[PDB]
Design a protein around this ligand. Structure first.
Ligand SMILES: Nc1nc2c(ncn2[C@@H]2O[C@H](COP(=O)(O)OP(=O)(O)OP(=O)(O)O)[C@@H](O)[C@H]2O)c(=O)[nH]1
Lengths: 70, 71, 221, 850, 83, 77
RNA sequence: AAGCAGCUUUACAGAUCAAUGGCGGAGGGAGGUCAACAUCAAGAACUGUGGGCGCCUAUAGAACUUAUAACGAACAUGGUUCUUGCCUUUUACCAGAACCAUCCGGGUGUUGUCUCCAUAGAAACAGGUAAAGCUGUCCGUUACUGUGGGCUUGCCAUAUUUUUUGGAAC
């Protein structure tokens, strides 16, 4: 997962929402910190800009690689 | 890690708790499990009244049930 | 490998051999190592002794840089009636605090004041042993595994055979303070310089003390 | 716009841009204001934090990089470098981290260690809500550190102590490990002994074990968090840290207050920390670098470079310590755990000015502490208590010399307050100033344009409403830990350079706050510094740096304070309205208590120590000393109408004694009689009250058989055992120089002898002490006690033998002091007695008959 | 394990937006953050999932109920992430 | 100041009838005396009687070992 | 801190045996009381003169630092001007000041030589500066496996409220 650092991630939480952003760091609990992360629900429609955020490893369901690193 | 409620000590605090429950009471005790001892336990019933459940017999509420608390 | 090579430009030594050279060089090195012991014998202090025309009783006396001509003519200030004569304010104070005690100094270098007092204890006894010259000291997770012993366990003795020699050498002057250094010509080694920079001990023949003063004179010049 | 202006400032490991974003938050800014005695490693520890934060300092050479000559970063002054001390506060703004990687920014201020500079230490206490008192092991807890503990407790400021120079006890002393731990038990024992309401130790994150020359600071919690966090689980590690320090032992997983029959007694600080440390040192200077290298690759996870392996023993040891004890996040952790913003900050800002209710959030209210010259330009060190300060804003300024006047003006409640614009704002970085657009709450900043309004300390505020002007509280003038009695009269050698010199003196009053500059009407200038070295720094800074003039300098002098011995035998009416005032000395404890409402006042006075309900009830006022009123004719409210005026004329009477026109000290004035004529005109009434008050108090002392009072430097000396007698001989060389207690410092040859020497007798007494002791002794002169003793001899002695060019005999001393002070102030013009003070003639005949 | 918590620690004094499990969002300056993710805010404005908005002074919400917390972008470059 | 475990212990000494609200269930509220509890705060209740909120009737439940995780609100009645 | 797995390598058997990708290499390393040649405190905003792209590399021209203690933990000798006694002239001078200079020496950096220690090679080709794999091509292992080393890593211990042993389902 450390190999997965800085990659843009599309993550899906237990509430069904999708959060997109570069993973800045994680932990054992899988608490993620996302750069310039944006929220989206229905799909692009109903999208919002969170920015720098930290999502908890308990409510997270799964995450996938989105785009290239920088 | 012991949570610091010291700034809420002996103050009237309004808990919100799982199941759209709302409590109001003066803080007494707490612990690392965050379980709370309240005085003057006050339920907020669904609409108009606020039921006063406990006066001098205080109360204790398990921690994880707490959504949050306000001063 | 202890030296740069046949050109013999650089040298690097181990601890024990340098300690040997030190214990051999004790007669020629008087162990003046304390810097605070030099008070008013700093080169700064002698320069200020020259610019102020004030001779430390141990230091050399010089020609004054500025010929003494008095323009005071006793104004209201520093009159005999105004000032209070109590403390002798002898020359040593003038070289001690150049600006405060002295009026109109020129080209005066600020002295070093002092380092903290030197508590150094030289052994004459195991390493890290309590000196009888010291003042006595008045006094007034319970489980853990079987493992976890304090750091550097199995290292046996705390004091190695050389560590005393290490500590005694740690405070050595510029020559012996180091395990490596450049080569200096025998022309460039001053052995007798560290002898006249010291306070002359009492009960020397007056001629010897005068020799100290002359040597210091050439040195400061 | 200022991007092209900097280019000098060194790049910092953390970006400087984020630091100000951290500065926007009042919670994240802690002001350290590090304190400590002389040569305690303060500037060197601050240097460790600066080198720690920045990348590569341009002003450090290869030699100071090896660590031979200790780098002092925070002293950029020519004199501070050459003379080797610290003088003016120069701190740093350092974003720092705890054991938790949370990064709190800190404003450090290094107060000079030498005692004559304690003014800067007072500015540091008033500046900093935290205090790191850096204590030397070998010097133990000195009396100066005691004064810093009691002093910081007085103004309510948190303290986090740093025990420093362990490598001295380890190398110089070569203490056995158990005995050295006993030394630490002695240091901390005295520490908690002089701290009344707190318990400091390595646990609780208060004491910080450090050696600056070899560049490492660590706390037991930081250390365990480093090298014991691998073996110990996270569950028991906290309690394990809490139990490390004392009165416990260890074998295998077993803890007892007793050694439990084991062959070795190692009370768990020795064994777990202090022994690994000793083995680090002894192996570092001693052990072969190969197997040592193997230890560091094994135990501490340290990898040595070949260049590192090739270092000399001292630089190699410094480098090994910087690898074992990593970049310093522990000391900052102890800073955080030490300082709690609540229960303190409000108490602090209430102690500095007035107890009040919060502050209006809109208005900007900030204390102006010290005027510093930095790049050769006038700056102002300002701490913002509330509101935000923008570059280019117009702000009101008031020198704290006028404060209580304004506060009384509000208690009776355009503006007389001169306003100035902020030209620039900066964050002190030590050798560089980092400019910032706007300054925020709870931080220490510099401003260029403020320096012109105020003499030394000021209040700086901008209000958005007038109700705020009603609700503003202003800062009391800074209380300097030590009063400055050291007196030197100056004149320029070329009088035509006098005007420029005047400007210089003004700048001096701004740059050195504790200096008290007096301008005598005879043209001879007077300067009052704390002591010898402080006034010397004043002179070198005054001439070379600011105004370059040949300056004649009189022998060092003192301020004398007139007083009375017995009770005034006669009550003399005084007219140009006839007032007779009786005088009497204060009680012993009444003085000490004074230097440091009416019902509570009479209860504290009477209760605490002897008084009568009429006297203690009728006390009108206290100053600097206390005016009292005890006729039977007090019945009319007249004395209540003129009471304020009597307290005024009493102020002018006490500010100038009858003898030397010097401040009256320890004298209670009780009013026996006040006459009022038939006709009353308030202007001529009061304007004739003032002179009769001044003359009244003069007659008060002179009828009491007045005595002079000389100040007394309290003397702290560190000598060795064999050189103790010589010092005692020096004490017999001076009229003063009482020795009281000779304190044995544990585990060191140094005996610290306390003493008292009068400031007249002491001139370069430090220097003579050192030359007599051959550099093995050290002397310090500290007068914060405001203790005054009578110079032996009786003033008003017509026949006393005074040698013109030689010191005078003991019994004749006070006489020549009075004479020569009167002449230096031009009062003589040629025993004041009562004649010019109007004993009149016939009554003067009557007193001559008695 | 350091960065996620230690970040939320360094978020004190910064305006943050909590979204909770029930969906009610609490914005405001973060007064305190305990290592267990229990957080305490002052000057909090709350938005219910239905859109209802209120303003409140002192709030303290447990960790276990936090859906996530958004901290200002200033921390993007911080000494935390430097290895 | 009184810790919640010793407060629950105080209710244990007092023995007064205790009303308990469960977790994420608003329909039932159980009543009865506390005969003991553990460090996990799993409480064995005496004379347990249901109190449906959905006029309040109930079925006597006897003694019960009640798991602390469902335990939410402990009071007296 | 053992083992397992992952990562990096590695003596390697290897897939490919192509296009690749990585790391190194396209001119060695020590030494010499061996030479010659340049300089000799580090700064540097700011500008100028050039390159590389308002920024770095190279130079000098002022600001504003201390050289400092010490190109050298040493320290000589002259010259010029000023002053002091010899003095009264040339020397030679005693003692200082200021500014120059001579000598004794040293670090570097560039090359050239002159002796020990080495084994792949792709150390092959073409471009230029004041410099070099500096650039382009290029080749050595090789980019995906299993045995062998090291860690920068997780387990070797957590099912009891704040995370992973769910309060969901409908
Ligand atoms: N032997 C030894 N000397 C030390 C140690 N730490 C500091 N010193 C010396 O103590 C001196 C004083 O420290 P500084 O920081 O330079 O100055 P200071 O302590 O602030 O003293 P002031 O500047 O006058 O306030 C330093 O110059 C060091 O030479 C140490 O650990 N061991």
């Amino acid at each position: 997962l450390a190999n997965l650092i800085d990659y843009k991630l599309r993550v899906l939480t237990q509430d069904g929402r999708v959060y997109i952003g570069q993973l800045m760091a994680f932990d054992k609990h899988m608490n993620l910190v996302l750069n310039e992360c944006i929220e989206e629900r229905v799909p692009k429609v109903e999208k919002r800009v969170l920015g720098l955020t930290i999502l908890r490893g308990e409510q997270i369901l799964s995450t996938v690689v989105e785009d290239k690193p920088l | 890690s012991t949570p610091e409620l010291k700034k809420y000590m002996d103050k009237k605090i309004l808990l919100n708790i799982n199941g759209s429950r709302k409590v109001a009471g003066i803080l007494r005790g707490y612990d690392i499990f965050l379980n709370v001892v309240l005085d003057d336990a006050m339920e907020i019933n669904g609409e108009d009244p606020a039921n006063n459940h406990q006066l001098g017999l205080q109360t204790v509420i398990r921690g994880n049930s707490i959504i949050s608390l306000e001063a | 490998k202890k030296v740069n090579g046949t050109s013999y430009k650089k040298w690097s030594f181990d601890l024990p051999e340098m300690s040997n050279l030190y214990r051999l060089s004790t007669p020629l090195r008087d162990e003046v190592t304390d810097k605070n012991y030099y008070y008013l014998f700093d080169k700064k202090s002698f320069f200020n002794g020259k610019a102020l025309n004030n001779a430390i009783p141990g230091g050399p006396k010089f020609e004054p840089l500025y010929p003494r001509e008095e323009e005071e003519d006793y104004n209201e200030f520093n009159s005999i009636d105004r000032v209070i004569f109590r403390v002798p304010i002898r020359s040593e104070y003038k070289v001690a605090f150049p600006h405060l005690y002295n009026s109109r100094p020129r080209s005066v270098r600020i002295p070093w004041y002092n380092n903290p007092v030197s508590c150094i204890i030289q052994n004459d006894t195991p390493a890290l042993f309590f000196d009888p010259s010291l003042n006595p000291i008045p006094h007034f997770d319970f489980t853990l595994p079987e493992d976890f012993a304090p750091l550097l366990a199995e290292e046996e003795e705390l004091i190695l055979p050389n560590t005393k020699d290490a500590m005694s050498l740690y405070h050595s002057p510029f020559p012996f303070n180091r395990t490596k250094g450049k080569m200096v010509r025998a022309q460039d080694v001053a052995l007798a310089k560290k002898w006249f920079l010291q306070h002359p001990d009492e009960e020397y023949p007056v001629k010897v003390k005068v020799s100290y003063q002359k040597l210091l004179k050439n040195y400061v010049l | 716009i200022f991007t092209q202006l900097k280019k000098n400032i060194p790049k910092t490991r953390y970006n400087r841009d984020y630091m100000l974003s951290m500065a926007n938050i009042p919670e994240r800014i802690i002001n350290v204001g590090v304190i400590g005695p002389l040569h305690s490693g303060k500037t060197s520890l601050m240097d460790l934090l600066v080198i720690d934060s920045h990348k590569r300092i341009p002003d450090m050479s290869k030699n100071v990089e090896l660590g031979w000559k200790p780098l002092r970063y925070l002293d950029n002054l020519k004199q501070e470098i050459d003379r080797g001390l610290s003088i003016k506060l120069n701190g740093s703004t350092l974003l720092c981290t705890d054991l938790e990687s949370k990064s709190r920014m800190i404003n450090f201020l290094d107060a000079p260690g030498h005692v004559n500079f304690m003014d800067e230490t007072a500015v540091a206490l008033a500046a900093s809500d935290l205090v790191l008192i850096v204590i030397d092991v070998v010097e133990g807890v000195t009396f100066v550190v005691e004064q810093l503990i009691k002093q910081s407790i007085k103004n309510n400021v948190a303290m986090c102590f740093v025990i420093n120079k362990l490598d001295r006890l380890i190398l110089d002393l070569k203490l056995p490990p158990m005995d050295a731990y006993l030394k630490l038990n002695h240091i901390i024992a005295n520490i908690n002994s002089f701290t009344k309401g707190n318990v400091f130790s390595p646990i609780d994150n208060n004491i910080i074990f450090a050696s600056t020359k070899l560049g490492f600071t660590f706390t037991i919690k930081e250390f365990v968090s480093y090298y014991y966090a691998h073996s110990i689980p996270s569950s028991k590690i906290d309690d394990f840290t809490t139990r490390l320090w004392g009165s416990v032992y260890y074998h295998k997983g077993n803890f007892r207050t007793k050694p439990f029959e084991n062959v070795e007694k190692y009370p768990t600080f020795v064994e777990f920390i202090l022994i690994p440390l000793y083995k680090i040192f002894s192996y570092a200077l001693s052990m072969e670098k190969d197997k040592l290298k193997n230890l560091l690759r094994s135990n501490f996870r340290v990898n040595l470079s070949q260049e590192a392996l090739q270092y000399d023993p001292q630089p190699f040891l410094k480098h090994v310590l910087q690898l074992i004890f990593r970049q310093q996040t522990g000391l900052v952790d102890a800073i955080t755990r030490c300082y709690q913003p609540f229960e303190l900050f409000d108490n602090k800002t209430a102690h500095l000015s007035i107890p009040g209710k919060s502050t209006p959030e809109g208005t900007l209210w900030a204390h102006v502490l010290k005027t510093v010259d930095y790049g050769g330009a006038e700056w102002s060190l300002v701490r913002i208590y509330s509101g935000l300060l923008k570059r280019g804003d117009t702000v009101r300024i008031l020198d704290t010399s006028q404060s209580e006047s304004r506060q009384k003006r509000q208690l009776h409640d355009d503006d007389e307050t001169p306003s100035c614009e902020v030209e620039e704002i900066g964050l002190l970085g030590g050798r560089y100033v980092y400019p910032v657009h706007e300054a925020h709450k709870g931080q220490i900043v510099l401003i260029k344009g403020i320096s012109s309004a105020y003499i030394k300390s000021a209040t700086l505020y901008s209000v958005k409403s007038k109700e705020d002007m009603k609700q503003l509280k202003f800062f009391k003038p800074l209380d300097y830990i030590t009063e400055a009695v050291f007196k030197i009269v100056l004149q320029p050698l070329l009088p035509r350079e006098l005007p420029k010199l005047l400007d210089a003196l003004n700048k001096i009053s701004k740059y050195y706050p504790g200096v008290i500059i007096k301008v005598e009407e005879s043209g001879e200038h007077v300067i009052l510094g704390n002591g010898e070295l402080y006034m010397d720094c004043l002179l070198y800074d005054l001439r070379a740096s600011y105004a370059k003039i040949e300056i004649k300098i009189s022998d060092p002098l003192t301020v004398f304070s007139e007083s009375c011995s017995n009770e005034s035998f006669a009550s003399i009416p005084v007219s140009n309205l006839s007032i007779s005032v009786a005088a009497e000395p204060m009680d012993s404890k009444m003085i000490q208590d004074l230097s440091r409402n009416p019902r509570k006042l009479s209860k504290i006075l009477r209760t605490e120590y002897g008084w009568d309900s009429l006297a203690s009830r009728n006390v009108w006022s206290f100053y600097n000393l206390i005016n009292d009123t005890l006729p039977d004719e007090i019945s009319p409210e007249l004395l209540s109408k003129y009471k304020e005026q009597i307290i005024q004329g009493f102020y002018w009477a006490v500010k100038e004694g009858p003898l030397a026109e010097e401040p009256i000290y320890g004298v209670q004035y009780k009013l026996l009689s006040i006459s009022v004529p038939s006709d009353v005109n308030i202007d001529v009434m009061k304007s004739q009250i003032i002179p009769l008050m001044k003359k009244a108090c003069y007659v008060g002392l002179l009828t009491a058989i007045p005595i002079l009072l000389e100040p007394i430097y309290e003397v702290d000396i560190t000598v060795h055992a064999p050189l103790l007698p010589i010092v005692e001989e020096l004490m017999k060389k001076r009229r003063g120089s009482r020795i009281y207690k000779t304190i044995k410092v544990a585990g060191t040859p140094l005996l610290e002898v306390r003493g008292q020497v009068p400031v007249i007798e002491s001139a370069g007494f430090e220097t003579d002490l050192r030359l007599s002791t051959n550099g093995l002794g050290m002397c310090q002169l500290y007068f914060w006690h405001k203790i005054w003793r009578k110079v032996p001899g009786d003033v008003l002695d017509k026949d006393a033998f005074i040698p013109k060019l030689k010191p005078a005999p003991i019994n004749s001393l006070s006489r020549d002091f009075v004479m020569k002070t009167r002449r230096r102030k031009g009062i003589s013009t040629g025993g004041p007695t009562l004649e010019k003070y109007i004993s009149a003639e016939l009554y003067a005949q009557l007193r001559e008959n008695g | 394990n350091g960065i996620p918590v230690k970040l939320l620690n360094e978020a004190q004094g910064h305006i943050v937006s909590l979204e909770l499990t029930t969906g009610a969002t609490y914005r405001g300056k973060l007064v305190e953050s305990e290592d267990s993710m229990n957080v305490q805010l002052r000057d909090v404005i709350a938005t219910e999932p239905q859109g209802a908005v209120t303003h409140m002074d002192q709030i303290f919400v447990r960790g276990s109920q936090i859906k996530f917390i958004v901290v200002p972008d200033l921390l993007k470059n911080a000494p935390l992430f430097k290895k | 100041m009184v810790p919640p475990i010793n407060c629950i212990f105080n209710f244990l000494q007092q023995q007064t009838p205790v009303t308990i609200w469960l977790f994420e269930q608003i329909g039932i509220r159980i009543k009865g005396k506390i005969v003991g509890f553990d460090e996990f705060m799993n409480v064995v209740i005496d004379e347990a009687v249901e109190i449906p909120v959905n006029v309040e009737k109930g079925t006597p439940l006897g003694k019960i070992l009640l798991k602390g995780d469902n335990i939410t609100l402990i009071t007296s009645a």
